[model samples]
Target: MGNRAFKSHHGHFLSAEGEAVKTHHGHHDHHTHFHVENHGGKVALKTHCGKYLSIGDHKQVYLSHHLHGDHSLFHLEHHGGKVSIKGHHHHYISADHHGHVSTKEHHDHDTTFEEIII
Candidate 1:
């Protein structure tokens, strides 16, 4: 995975994933928070989110294969804050990966995605 389950919402369906960051401050540090990584899916070199990724698609989501640590994998969500899709690569349906559970898996799919896409 890349970071958390949350990333940008600029898939083919979303030309722009808005810009509203919510700062997260700790008792001993300052941090910025946005969304969370609550989903997974089948991974493919040329295929992510059930579809191939384009140039701009890179910024659209956080790929699980893009990270080398505990923070990786990107998913999509509405600018207002809601888990609605299942896989962004499949056009624009990664909201299903924005929750605490990987809907694509539990819902009925044999995909092995440790990351979320929007």
Candidate 2:
């Protein structure tokens, strides 16, 4: 399978640094390429560092080295031509202009993303 990148509606790509999930403007690099995995019918995004994207306390997004739990799994909801990523905690993943990534209870423009295969 090929690598993928999640591009936000606001024109930033999802990126990871250490355990933190952030957004990078206009650049698709190693930190932006996520390995997409199918868990049953849901999706799991593994970083280039070999860590899975997971939901943590306060709905913060992080990368976890283990995928033994369901926190790493997410559901993709399509809206128009974009998709919103919903975590197992029933929250939607969102990124802001300051590159902060988190999960929210509502799905809006911040939650919408375009999955790019690279």
Candidate 3:
């Protein structure tokens, strides 16, 4: 077993949404905050909206509160200053300059995330 929950290092919860996680003032909407839960070696991003983060077949990430999909599960890994969430096909979750986030074939520094235990 692993740690049950984790908040971002900035005290923001990674809100799993269609395009990106909600953010404000370097923080995120408390109401939409999430719990990064470890299940075996993989993890589930439980959003405040009662949904889980899932990577679509096309590689789009979204919140799926009512569906149990394999894409919702991620293999969590730690790298230097951030964490990487790898999807079913071993793709990494990363964001672009426009704040658009999606699964990528390679790791992007922008995709690295930090966590703070709450």
Candidate 4:
């Protein structure tokens, strides 16, 4: 068959961390979509490149992959995230009230990405 969802699964063990890496090859596809604008039509944020993202103050978000250059299995701490990314540099995310809900929802209607870095 073909890719199924937004995640992948691989049944191999890693010698470094003794972990199984999910292979995206011929597997799943990340569901990436863009919202042009609302009825009011405000300036689309993160327009330059990459996209807007957020992580808790100390929640410790792990980047699944570089998502920029060649696809490779990696495990890097988020820091929890950074500013400029492919034109999206200086992109800032503020805390409101839900954590992943805000980043995951994208509507900014949720209370995630709060002040705490997590």
Give me the candidate number with maximum TM-score: 2
> On residues 79-100, what C-alpha lDDT tens digit does candidate 2 reach at each position?
7887788766577887765656
Q: Write the per-residue lDDT of candidate 1 for residues 13-100, one digit (tens) a residue.
A: 1211224222112333323222233434432222233322222242234334443222243333343343333443343333332231
TM-score of 3: 0.64
Which regions of candidate 2 deviate over 4 angstroms?
17-21, 26-32, 66-69
lDDT of 2: 0.67
Cα lDDT of candidate 3 equals: 0.56
Query: Who is ahead in TM-score, 1 or 3?
Result: 3
Q: Candidate 3 residues 1-118, lDDT tens each?
A: 2322333344343443454565322334333345666666566666454667666755366666633335666677787876777776767776553455666777756566665443
lDDT of 3 at 72: 69
**Which window of 10 residues has the lowest lDDT sum in candidate 4?**
8-17
- lDDT winner between 1 and 2, please give it: 2
Those runs of model 1 whose alpha carbons end farther than 4 Å from true positions after fitting are: 1-63, 67-75, 79-81, 85-100, 105-118
Worst 10 residues of 3 by lDDT: 1-10
In Å, residue 93's CA in model 1 sits off its true spot by 8.4
Put down candidate 4 lDDT per residue, 1-118, tens digits, no spaces.
1112111112211111112212222323432222222112122222124432223333222223123321111111112322111112222222223122112222232211211110
| Model 1 TM-score, all chains together | 0.18
Q: How many Å off is the CA of 15 in candidate 2?
A: 2.4
